[PDB]
Amino acid sequence: SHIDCRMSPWSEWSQCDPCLRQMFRSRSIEVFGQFNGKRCTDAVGDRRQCVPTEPCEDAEDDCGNDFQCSTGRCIKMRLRCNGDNDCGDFSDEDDCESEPRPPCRDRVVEESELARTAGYGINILGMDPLSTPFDNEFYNGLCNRDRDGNTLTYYRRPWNVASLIYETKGEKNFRTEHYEEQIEASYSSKKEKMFLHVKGEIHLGRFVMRNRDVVLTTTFVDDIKALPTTYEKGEYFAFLETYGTHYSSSGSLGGLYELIYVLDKASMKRKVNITSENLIDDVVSLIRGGTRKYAFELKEKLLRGTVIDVTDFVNWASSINDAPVLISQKLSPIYNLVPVKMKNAHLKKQNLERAIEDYINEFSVRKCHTCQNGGTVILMDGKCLCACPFKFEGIACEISK
Amino acid sequence: SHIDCRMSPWSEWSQCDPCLRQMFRSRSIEVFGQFNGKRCTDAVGDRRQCVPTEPCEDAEDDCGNDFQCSTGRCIKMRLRCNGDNDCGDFSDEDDCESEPRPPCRDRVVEESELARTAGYGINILGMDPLSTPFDNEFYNGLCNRDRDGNTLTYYRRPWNVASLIYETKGEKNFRTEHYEEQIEASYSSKKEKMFLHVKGEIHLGRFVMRNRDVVLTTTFVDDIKALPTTYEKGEYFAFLETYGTHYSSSGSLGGLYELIYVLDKASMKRKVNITSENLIDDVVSLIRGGTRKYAFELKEKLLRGTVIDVTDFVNWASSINDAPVLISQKLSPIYNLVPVKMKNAHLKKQNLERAIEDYINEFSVRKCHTCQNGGTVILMDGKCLCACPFKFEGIACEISK
């Protein structure tokens, strides 16, 4: 049959928040639509404005001896006038008395774009990179640099990055298999299978982020501060959707490609001459990174299987330098970035842990009803679906032919 | 079936640290996810702000008759005004009265980029190098140099490096194997195997760091000085993640490459003609160092196996000069670099040692559940996984075909 989405009843309203002036309630999901069913709408929260009983009195420690930026971030006094922006809106450079003192002291450096986006936020489900939560325009008055071999140019290193090494390396692989069975006795039988696999990687650099004493962007801290004190599933699920659930503490950059090819053959002769011939083919290719000119040409050449020259491979490898992607990650939980000096920071961290665990528990493929004949279940926008093998071409993998 | 990540219960909160104003606790990991299980979040620490009972009185002894840099690093008075920066930010060059006295005395020398980044910190698991903890711009009023034959240029030697030898040498290795067994009696059988291995290495230089009277960067000393006095697993694990566990006391630089080929064949005939033919290949190529134009060209030329010209080998050889890598290391523990002149430095050394032992004990392949039919177990980002030979293609290496 067809299975429709069904959702749980709502919970009880919370009390009025003195500062947000809102109340919250939540529900749960039981079954996803399957077999041309209705997909779930995923509205798992609710909010309604209220009238608080107590005034919102919220205070945090002042900088003290440190400077107060116009955006609220406390920075050190020695950074009042130099060659860099530290408050995030050039709030400190607008009151320079006299004699600016750049930290690099006339040395020639360049701002690396490779290190300006490091530390991508990653959703645990789907592994889609997001915008980095860090602020990599902050230098803390230092002139740390590093040299790139290809261009003989020194790139200055941000504060949050603890390691940035430019390196040249590559990988390749080519595995093929071939089996063949022939049975005859009249009677006959012939079998043939063939598997191919080509995969290669190109590496550009590798970075390591910091753990203690980091500086985050103002918008991230503002969105953290807006969280409710108690535990509301909807608001924390929204935060986890916006900012991901884990962030890349280290990774590598470059490009890659792949190719998968499967061949199948069958036959049977009897003697009532009954002869059958079965042929099933499937070719898959993928490619990521580089420039949109060389890469697609290389992708189309790889698909034919014809022998091609090295110049296009070199062109693509050289073009990787201007549009790299993220090939390796090392995930770390998002609640580690909560600033320590903040009202009820520990409660926010515990709640973020619980919300990540509940988010993993929900939106799970394990709740989908099992398919038939060893099919594979995939979850896609709140609707379960089955993937079928070569012989079966049903919606639920039930039609055999 | 499937195994999910599980972690031990929390430990008890410690007392409030009078200077950090925090308290810490920690837990452990019991099992990693395996067989499509949930990977571990690796949250082994916790921290929370507290209120101290006694005010934090923190100080270190001043230089005395030595100069006091603005970052705290003591340097000798004879270095107050010369041709080099010793404070790390040109704090000593801001009061040069008259008659500058450069140390090298007009001789033409260059800053060697090879020795400027020597002394990489190395993580014990994965052997990924990190940024050097030493500050290689300190010269201590010396003009030690060394000659490179290729360019006939003399390169200054920093204080921390005790040896800098430029030398040219090359190696190669070429081993092939071939077996062929034929068994028949009707009956028949034919077996055949073939193995390839090519590898050669290029050396550029070799360095040895110092042991006594070394100078470290300010940031490393500050990160050490912020550590809690007692033993807290989380904070010292964070320190290890940031700075690695070992640092290379000596090493070499250059490049290398590899090529690995495996062939396998089999047959079996019975007589009802039953015939079987299996053919299996596997090729791997790797290359590190050099420039991304010639290097990848040679990588591709190697795969096709045709005879190539020597000019590309020579071109890659000449380009290895501009982007060397770390081919050989000799690790030393990181706690040997804890300065003697510091509050409770010995306790920091003991804690670091115990934390390195604990970090080795966890994240070990030994807790992963074993595979079946001779599989190989690899741990990758908190998730055990099995590697299967040519014959088996199951998830647990149990499906044979």
């Epitope: 009390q15 009983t53 107590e54 009195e57 205070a59 420690d61 002042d62 003290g64 004190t229 108690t230 009202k343 009820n344 520990h346 409660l347 | 909160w13 929370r48 702000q49 507290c50 209120v51 101290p52 009972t53 006694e54 005010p55």
Partner: antibody, heavy 121, light 107 residues
Framework: QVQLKESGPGLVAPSQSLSITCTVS????????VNWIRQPPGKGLEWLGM???????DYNSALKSRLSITKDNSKSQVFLKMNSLQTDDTARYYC???????????????WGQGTLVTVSA | DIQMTQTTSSLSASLGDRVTISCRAS??????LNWYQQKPDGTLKLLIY???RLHSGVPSRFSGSGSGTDYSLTISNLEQEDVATYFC?????????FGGGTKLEIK
Amino acid sequence: QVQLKESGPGLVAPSQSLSITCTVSGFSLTVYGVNWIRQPPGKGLEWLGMIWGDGSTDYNSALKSRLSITKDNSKSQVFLKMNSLQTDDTARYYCARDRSYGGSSAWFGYWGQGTLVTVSA
Amino acid sequence: DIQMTQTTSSLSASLGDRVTISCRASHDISNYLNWYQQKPDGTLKLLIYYTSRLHSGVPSRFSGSGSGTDYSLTISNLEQEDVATYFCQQGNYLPYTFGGGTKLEIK
């Protein structure tokens, strides 16, 4: 509408335990902490102890071995247990709310009403 | 234990006059001071926290100032509803300590 009510025995033996209850209203104890303060006659105030919203307890250095604070967040009630009383423990006992969930520099915004406990000599 | 001293145990003034109450701390508490008011029959109420900040529900006649070690609480336009005893308490290191207490009278 934040308010706190207090209940005490009133008369205790010179060697008999205490049992004091401070029920809260207008807020939940899960995200706030409660402090206990006593005022001996003719003198000033004195901070005694504190319990966090989490469950952690802090005590003054002198009365560490005597005090005991317990919480029941279901009924929104706070208990104080003091044992082996002396004649100097006669004071007015207040309960006041903490600034936040707990673990930071604090001011006591909302106070109780006050309960006097006399130890017979 | 930080010791805070209030020298003026008593003070007498008339309506409409400015009165200043001085409270001096032992250590340096880093601008963490609070003022409490105690009318008779044991009622307490926080007026000034963080050494310059009016608590919600408190009229604007009360104001505080001071920094470092010496602080003062200034009452302007004294009325007949401001006859109480004022306390100073620190909140930097636990245990928290209160001051001696100054009783304000009107003549």
